[PDB]
Design a protein around this ligand. Structure first.
Ligand SMILES: O=C(O)CCC(=O)C(=O)O
Ligand SMILES: O=C(O)CCC(=O)C(=O)O
Ligand SMILES: [Fe+3]
Ligand SMILES: [Fe+3]
Ligand SMILES: [Fe+3]
Lengths: 206, 229
């Protein structure tokens, strides 16, 4: 399938919301999940964070104990779209060995709000970003670089649920800063990002 | 089974995807016969069901089909004898004749951390539920009031959602997983966790979403005596 092929070749794939089918339920689960971004703690950047124990074969997901950033809100974690996104996102990743589908994975779930970088990697095996909202913001392009620190592509997530897949060990990435269009109002860019790292020796935590 | 036992002791549940099983021709066939039974449950959003209780002695492998207590008897007595308090039809004759049913009932039990070795010589009541969930174009966290549980996914049709939730005894969400393939399996210790399943919704919204599960609940019953069969 498309998304899996592209990360094998290029190291990244795009999936704009236009090409997604958004029913009324999913509509309202996005509306509720996206409303959470109004309620992140500072340290301008407002954020929330948690990690998940994940096994793709069974779809098992476990909220790992919170180790710092503020934890994801109770309503966020209650929203079925969080872990449905988590599971669905993962299918778009070219895993090198089917066996890894049966090993544990650490999945970092980041709620970021930016209020108005060089090429790096997020130190995971695969990542995903979903644009939750954009308000009075110019710039903020997503950038794919090579391991040679040479820009190979640049694009802009603009619509809610716009999504980008990437193989964090193949490319380097960054996002240009955002600045307000109306100089009197602030720029706000609401992003949901998850980093997936294969961890065969991770254990369940009680 | 050893891993499943410790997993039940630590976490209160254990997962066994069908991929981790070796289904030969004979077994694969009995599975298909068993799953097809779900196409013939009684019509009373939509929930079709059948049910029976089995007398079970783990040491000898003895399974006896307990008589189906009529609903009019339970209701008018205000005494459901441990069983469910609903009006449900019996398991079909071709469900009971399928050897996979007896096999599952015996084999599933070997995944439970039985606290006392003497318990293997006592009778156990084993409730057997065939559930078909239909969503045409939810219950909260609970226990089943048994010692141990097992759920086998028989079928999933046009179904999204339907995630199984494991909750702590303080009603806190601790785990969540997806039975997706036929015979995907989940064992749990029913006094150690709470559980629930999310609703299904249709993928193609013009057609119904359908989810078929076999559920068994094992309750240690040392006073239970044999009944006629
Ligand atoms: O905002 C983006 O496009 C990605 C942000 C990112 O990579 C990070 O915050 O680590
Ligand atoms: O169908 C499931 O996953 C479990 C449903 C359940 O808990 C029940 O029907 O008692
Ligand atoms: Fe990054
Ligand atoms: Fe239950
Ligand atoms: Fe599965």
């Amino acid at each position: 399938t498309e998304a899996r092929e592209e990360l094998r070749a290029n190291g990244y794939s795009l999936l704009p919301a236009d090409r997604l089918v958004i029913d009324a339920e999913l509509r309202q689960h996005v509306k509720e999940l996206a409303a959470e971004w109004e309620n992140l703690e500072t340290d301008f950047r407002e954020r929330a964070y948690d990690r998940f124990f994940f096994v793709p074969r069974t779809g098992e997901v476990r909220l790992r104990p919170h180790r710092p950033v503020a934890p994801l809100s109770r309503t966020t974690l209650a929203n079925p779209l969080l872990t449905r996104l988590l599971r669905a996102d993962f299918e778009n990743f070219p895993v090198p060995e089917e066996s890894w589908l049966d090993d544990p994975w650490d999945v970092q779930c980041h709620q970021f709000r930016i209020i108005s970088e060089g090429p790096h990697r997020d130190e995971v095996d695969f990542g995903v970003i979903h644009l939750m909202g954009r308000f009075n913001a110019a710039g903020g392009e997503s950038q794919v670089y090579s391991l040679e620190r040479e820009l190979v592509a640049e694009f802009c997530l603009t619509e809610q649920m716009d999504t980008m897949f990437w193989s964090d060990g193949q490319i380097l990435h960054a996002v240009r800063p955002i600045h307000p269009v109306d100089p009197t109002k602030a720029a706000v860019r609401d992003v949901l990002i998850m980093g997936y790292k294969h961890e065969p020796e991770l254990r369940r935590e009680e």
